[PDB]
Design a protein around this motif. Structure first.
Motif, PDB file in Angstrom:
ATOM      1  N   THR C  41      40.942  11.080-126.578  1.00 18.39           N
ATOM      2  CA  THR C  41      40.322  10.048-125.764  1.00 18.39           C
ATOM      3  C   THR C  41      41.382   9.409-124.890  1.00 18.39           C
ATOM      4  OG1 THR C  41      40.638   8.418-127.509  1.00 18.39           O
ATOM      5  CG2 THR C  41      38.503   9.531-127.413  1.00 18.39           C
ATOM      6  N   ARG C  42      40.946   8.887-123.752  1.00 16.34           N
ATOM      7  CA  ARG C  42      41.832   8.188-122.840  1.00 16.34           C
ATOM      8  C   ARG C  42      41.769   6.696-123.100  1.00 16.34           C
ATOM      9  NH1 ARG C  42      42.280   8.741-116.243  1.00 16.34           N
ATOM     10  NH2 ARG C  42      43.840   7.084-115.997  1.00 16.34           N
ATOM     11  N   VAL C  43      42.931   6.065-123.142  1.00 24.15           N
ATOM     12  CA  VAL C  43      43.047   4.631-123.393  1.00 24.15           C
ATOM     13  C   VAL C  43      43.334   3.976-122.051  1.00 24.15           C
ATOM     14  CG1 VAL C  43      44.273   2.816-124.575  1.00 24.15           C
ATOM     15  CG2 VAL C  43      43.801   4.952-125.737  1.00 24.15           C
ATOM     16  N   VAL C  44      42.378   3.214-121.532  1.00 20.47           N
ATOM     17  CA  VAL C  44      42.558   2.659-120.197  1.00 20.47           C
ATOM     18  C   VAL C  44      43.454   1.432-120.241  1.00 20.47           C
ATOM     19  CG1 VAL C  44      41.397   1.718-118.198  1.00 20.47           C
ATOM     20  CG2 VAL C  44      40.360   3.591-119.461  1.00 20.47           C
ATOM     21  N   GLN C  45      43.274   0.580-121.247  1.00 16.85           N
ATOM     22  CA  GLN C  45      43.972  -0.698-121.259  1.00 16.85           C
ATOM     23  C   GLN C  45      45.465  -0.553-121.497  1.00 16.85           C
ATOM     24  OE1 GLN C  45      41.351   0.102-122.972  1.00 16.85           O
ATOM     25  NE2 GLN C  45      39.683  -1.191-122.220  1.00 16.85           N
ATOM     26  N   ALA C  46      45.936   0.633-121.850  1.00 15.74           N
ATOM     27  CA  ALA C  46      47.345   0.812-122.156  1.00 15.74           C
ATOM     28  C   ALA C  46      48.205   1.008-120.925  1.00 15.74           C
ATOM     29  CB  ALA C  46      47.532   2.004-123.095  1.00 15.74           C
ATOM     30  N   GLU C  47      47.607   1.230-119.756  1.00 18.03           N
ATOM     31  CA  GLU C  47      48.378   1.567-118.565  1.00 18.03           C
ATOM     32  C   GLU C  47      48.687   0.276-117.825  1.00 18.03           C
ATOM     33  OE1 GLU C  47      46.103   4.293-116.328  1.00 18.03           O
ATOM     34  OE2 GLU C  47      46.108   5.858-117.858  1.00 18.03           O
TER      35      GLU C  47
END
Lengths: 184, 46, 206, 109, 184, 46, 206
Positions: C41-47
């Motif tokens: 899964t892609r973690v959006v808030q980590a970028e």
């Protein structure tokens, strides 16, 4: 994924249940004909050696995977290192025949000698386990004789297997089976 | 079918190199494994 | 030469900038592999950016002074927690380094993203330009900016036992104040992950 | 589940990926990938353990220099049981759809 | 030709500036697949030798050019001079396997024996430098065993390289590096 | 591709002589070197 | 009567079930309000079950025995961390309660999601059915299942100073073993948030 276990119908759940995605498989290396085609060593006897696939050790890769099927069929390739003249005889022929050069005979040519042999047994398909410890004398590809044979190999061709049977691994004492793996 | 690497035809007739099969008159287990039930038996939620 | 970089809700602005250097590729390779069974899964808030100090660049530093920084590093934000909640991760790095004197300082720096950096030899530094880089020349720019993808022998990596990227900053020419420049220059970095993906939740401590 | 018709239980299977000690309590495991089922008309449950690893393939054998499993653990828990004391749960294992096996070798054994 | 050096964008000036004319280039000899395909010597060990490309000396032409890429892929050809029977084993197989003739085994045929081996590692592409001095045990093509091996050679096939790394020459003491060149 | 001098087809199948590649879903540096700027940045005279 | 509930990657299965009870609405109201300036975001990974113990239901408990559980509660998963990283949250609750004796036990339970529960009077329990509920009658079902949206005087709530929902479980009839039933019944709950949204990141502790 719930079902009735007593059914014995195969039920394969997948990762898509909790939201995974199943990947692509390439099974070539587990193909029966592929995995069983290769040479395996058999401890010979000085002069007469009956060609039999059950002589292969049970722990070898070719020996074990063979014994997991009740009913097997295949041709045979042999690789022999011997002195003198290697004489082969078809199934069910008398032992007194191995002394005749008329029967197929490979004159000694170093280092060794490779032959390809047909499936010569009368039975439509052979068997690894027979209900009747001994296996009937009619299961064999024939025999080979030489002044002395130093090494003997079997290679199955066109292998076909039926009715699988248990295949066992080594039982660890600890929680895992720890071996030394090749490392630089 | 087995392990064979020759891209050129075998020098000997098919009748010699191998034993010839006959006829009369992964088959079972692949047809068994292909029928495995991947579904959910009960109603799905969310 | 004004450039504004936005990652997540965080931004950075630089009035003296030479542009961006894209390492080894313009865009990430295939994310979804056969090895994870599609459970990634892609973690959006980590970028988003995070800031760290590098060193203080002073006149006494000769040629060859170098500073390794291995990535990922200890991170107390969201990106740090992921490393403890997921056994497999991948991401690209968007790196920015800032050394501010005034335009009367002299000397030059070379920043580079070096994959798999282990014990680079002294002579090997003369060829260090082979890796993605930019020069920081106080005569011109105060800022170096680099974007590089995820590299490794695996499609997902375990950041506990492996650090794929290493930020290295080398002094190609020593500092000179010439009486009108800053007495010393401090070097900072502003770094953001990109294209983070995770798999394999751990259990908790409780 | 082999138990009598008057006994009911509820179970949890879970996958603990490598890099951390596996969970000792269902509440700790509830954060992993897991399934949960209970007894009833159907006696059998089937759970697919994902192939999840960095490298596209994984060694069958276990190297002697490997202290902790590389592929992680699977854990089976008992949430609770009605009157199920002394009742047996038999377990089975078989290949999945995508299970693939390669590079034959003769290891003795 | 002036530009901003800090850009790191490649800038190649040409002779046409002061009035020259650029000539034609033929780069075949620097092609990666071409230059790395050839045999290079590796000091063997008496019996078991793990096939590893990092065992090649760093100063050899194949050794050096290999180590200039972080991530490399290729098949392998080996040329071995040995006594007895050379037995090969795929990656990640137990060391106890090298004693089985069932595994690929080349019976001794003088002067030497050449094999072609596939890329057997699980990793999509191997690496010359690993961040974790040691390199992980999973980087190897397997091992070979014989009664004794006198010589060992590696030849890479289909080589592919990624992410270049420093390549160093010999550092002269004088203004030039002066060697004796072949002359009649 | 590499150093190979045979003008005739290899005797063994492509599947044996080599390992078979798979797909999913000088490349970079030649595409980098081809973008080199050969021009003059300022006005030319004479 | 088989029912399978999936939230996130977690599931639950019940062979004896009376169905679902949707409290106060079938679907959430407007999420994006004027008060957050559109800075709210949905957290997908936070939606999944978590389990907790309630009490032990024994014959000695008379009518009126009740157990309050306020939501949200102390949560060590992802949902717990959110409460510390975001100053404003909202979500709906999907609640499931499980009390397993055998079918020879007797008595009944009433589970309800009561918004704004403060000191309910003893007599007020006779009318407790006004709130969303289901009966657990060991004669029939082992499971009660309730879905309710987010309610409050604000569109986003601060879960530190306010708990909108309170799970309450009341004994309408006392337990009877009748020698063939379980001696006592333990009550557990399996609860998942739904439609979580957050805003207003805090700073960190460092």
């Amino acid at each position: 994924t719930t079902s009735t276990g007593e059914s014995a119908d195969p039920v394969t759940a997948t990762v898509e249940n909790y939201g995974g995605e199943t990947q692509v498989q390439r099974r070539h290396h587990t193909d029966v004909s592929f995995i069983l085609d290769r040479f395996v060593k058999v401890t010979p006897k000085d002069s007469i050696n009956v060609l039999d696939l059950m002589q292969t050790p049970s722990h070898t890769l070719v020996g074990a995977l063979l014994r997991t099927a009740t009913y097997y069929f295949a041709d045979l390739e042999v690789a022999v290192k011997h002195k003198g003249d290697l004489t082969w005889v078809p199934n069910g022929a008398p032992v007194a025949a191995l002394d005749n050069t008329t029967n197929p005979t490979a004159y000694h040519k170093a280092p060794l000698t490779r032959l390809a042999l047909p499936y010569t047994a009368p039975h439509r398909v052979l068997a690894t386990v027979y209900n009747g410890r001994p296996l009937p004398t009619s299961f064999n590809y024939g025999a080979i004789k030489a002044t002395r044979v130093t090494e003997l190999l079997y290679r199955m061709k066109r292998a076909e297997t039926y009715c699988p049977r248990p295949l066992l691994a080594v039982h660890p004492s600890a929680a895992r089976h720890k071996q030394k793996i090749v490392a630089p | 079918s087995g392990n064979t690497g020759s891209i050129i035809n075998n020098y000997y007739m098919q009748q010699y190199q191998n034993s010839m099969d006959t006829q009369l008159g992964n088959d079972w287990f692949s047809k068994l494994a292909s029928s495995a039930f991947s579904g959910l038996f009960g109603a799905l939620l969310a | 030469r004004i450039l504004t970089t936005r990652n997540g809700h965080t931004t950075s602005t630089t009035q003296s900038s030479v542009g961006i250097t894209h390492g080894y590729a313009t865009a990430e390779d295939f994310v979804n592999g056969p090895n994870t069974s599609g459970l990634e899964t892609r973690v959006v808030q980590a970028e988003r950016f995070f800031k760290t100090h590098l060193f203080d660049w002073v006149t006494s530093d000769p040629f060859g002074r170098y500073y390794l920084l291995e990535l990922p590093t200890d991170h107390k934000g969201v990106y740090g927690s992921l490393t403890d909640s997921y056994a497999y991760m991948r991401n690209g790095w968007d790196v920015e380094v800032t050394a501010v004197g005034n335009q009367f300082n002299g000397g030059c720096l070379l920043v580079a993203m070096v994959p798999e950096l282990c014990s680079i030899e002294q002579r090997e530094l003369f060829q260090l330009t082979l890796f993605p880089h930019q020069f920081i020349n106080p005569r011109t720019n105060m800022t170096a900016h680099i974007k590089v993808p995820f590299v490794g022998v695996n499609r997902y990596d375990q950041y506990k036992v492996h650090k794929p990227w290493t930020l290295v900053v080398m002094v190609v020419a020593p500092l000179t104040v010439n009486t009108e420049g800053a007495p010393q220059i401090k070097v900072y970095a502003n770094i953001a992950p990109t294209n983070v993906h995770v798999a394999g939740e751990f259990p908790s401590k409780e | 589940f082999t138990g009598p018709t008057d006994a009911k239980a509820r179970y949890m299977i879970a996958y603990a990926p490598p890099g951390m000690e596996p969970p000792k309590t269902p509440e700790a495991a509830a954060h992993c990938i897991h399934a949960e089922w209970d007894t009833g008309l159907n006696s059998k449950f089937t759970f697919s353990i994902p192939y999840l690893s960095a490298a596209d393939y994984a060694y069958t054998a276990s190297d002697a220099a490997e202290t902790t499993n590389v592929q992680g653990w699977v854990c089976l828990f008992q949430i609770t049981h009605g009157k199920a004391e002394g009742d047996a749960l038999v377990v089975l294992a078989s290949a999945g759809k995508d299970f693939e096996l390669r590079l034959p070798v003769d290891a003795r054994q």
